[PDB]
């Protein structure tokens, strides 16, 4: 047999949200506003995927988190709220307009002391962190920015992760396009190439969760 997983219909999907999604009112408000104010609202993290991220922070008791791709800060705040008392999260983006709203909401959430915005190319922020002796220091890294650079960000995130640290990568399924070998758009070929790379990568243990637009988890092995 196989299929061996119960596939989601719109019916089943809605039921799942009804018995699982516990969105904090502040985050709910944050995406109502993101929808209202940003034409790019759709690149926002799925409430259910973010909730899984929050659960991972708690399970690992992650004290050092990186959030690559702030936008209006949904995932940054989702994980921020799950941080233990002494935990910190730095969030990366290059867009001032969206991050300004992010700051606003994570202040309103009481996370100004835990979350710090690094406004500049993530490529640069990651290289500074390494070239400043932070390799092996991070527990959890969430990669959700420009897709062209996911391999770079992944490679850098490995260096920065402690032993047993976790990489989470969003949008690995590309709304299904990734299964169409003939789609052939630049970004689609990059993600197809990337998914095979991670699947073969013996530096990690991994899994691909069909939540949000697909969430790959890669644990850095001993």
Ligand X SMILES: Nc1ncnc2c1ncn2[C@@H]1O[C@H](CSCC[C@H](N)C(=O)O)[C@@H](O)[C@H]1O
Residues placed in the known binding site for S-adenosyl-L-homocysteine = 45, 75, 93, 122, 146
Q: For residues 99 and 195, which CB has a smaller minimum distance to a copy of itself in the complex?
A: 195
Q: Which of 47, 69, 73, 80 binds a copy of itself (CB under 8 A)?
A: 47
CB 175 within 8 A of CB 13: no
Site for ligand X in 49-78 (CB under 6 A): 69-72, 74-75
By beta-carbon proximity to ligand X, the closer residue of 93 and 139 is 93
Q: What single string gives the DSSP state of each residue in 169-192?
A: EE-SSGGGGGG-TT---HHHHHHH
24, two tokens: 């904090």
Of residues 55-84, those binding a copy of itself (CB under 8 A)? 55-56, 58-61
CB atoms within 10 A of CB 192: 19
The stretch among 14-22, 71-79, 118-126, 168-176 that binds Ni ion (CB under 5 A) is 168-176
Sequence-separated contacts (24+) of 132-137 with Cβ below 8 Å = 134/160, 135/159, 135/160, 136/160, 136/161, 136/162, 136/163, 137/64, 137/162
- Cα 222 to Cα 217: distance, rounded to the nearest angstrom: 16
Residue 137 makes CB contacts below 8 A (sequence gap 6+) with 64, 160, 162
Question: In whole angstroms, what separates CA 217 from the centre of its chain?
Answer: 10
**Is residue 16 a contact point for a copy of itself (CB under 8 A)?**
yes
Q: Binding of Ni ion at residue 93 (CB under 5 A)?
A: no
Least distance CB 160 / a copy of itself (angstroms): 17
Interaction mask 116-155, Ni ion, x per CB under 5 A: ----------------------------x-----------
- The DSSP bridge partners found for residue 161 are 138
Q: CA-to-CA distance for 79 and 87, rounded, in angstroms? A: 10
Site for ligand X in 147-206 (CB under 6 A): none
User: Which residues make up the interface to ligand X (CB under 6 A)?
Assistant: 43-45, 69-72, 74-75, 92-95, 98, 121-122, 144-146
Point out which residues bind Ni ion (CB under 5 A).
144, 170-171
Residues that bind a copy of itself (CB under 8 A): 1-20, 22, 35, 42, 46-49, 51-52, 54-56, 58-61, 164, 166, 172-173, 175-176, 178-179, 195-196, 198-199, 205-214, 216-217, 219
């Amino acid at each position: 047999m196989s299929i061996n997983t119960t596939l989601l219909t719109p019916e089943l999907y809605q039921y799942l949200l009804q018995v699982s999604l516990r969105e904090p009112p502040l985050l709910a408000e944050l995406r109502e506003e993101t929808t209202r104010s940003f034409s790019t609202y759709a690149m926002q993290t799925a409430p259910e995927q973010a909730q899984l991220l929050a659960l991972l922070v708690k399970l690992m008791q992650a004290k050092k988190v990186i959030d690559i791709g702030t936008f209006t800060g949904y995932s940054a705040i989702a994980m921020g709220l799950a941080l233990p008392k002494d935990g910190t999260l730095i969030t990366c983006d290059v867009d001032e307009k969206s991050t300004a709203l992010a700051k606003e909401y994570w202040e309103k959430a009481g996370l100004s002391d835990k979350i710090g915005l690094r406004l500049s190319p993530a490529k640069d922020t990651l290289a500074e962190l390494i070239h400043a002796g932070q390799a092996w220091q991070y527990d959890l890294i969430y990669i959700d920015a420009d897709k062209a650079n996911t391999d770079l960000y992944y490679e850098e995130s490995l260096k920065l992760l402690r032993e047993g640290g976790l990489i989470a990568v969003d949008n690995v399924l590309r709304r299904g396009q990734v299964a169409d070998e003939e789609n052939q758009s630049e970004n689609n070929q990059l993600i197809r190439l990337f998914n095979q790379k991670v699947y073969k990568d013996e530096r990690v243990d991994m899994i691909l969760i069909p939540i949000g637009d697909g969430l790959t988890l890669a644990r850095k092995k001993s």
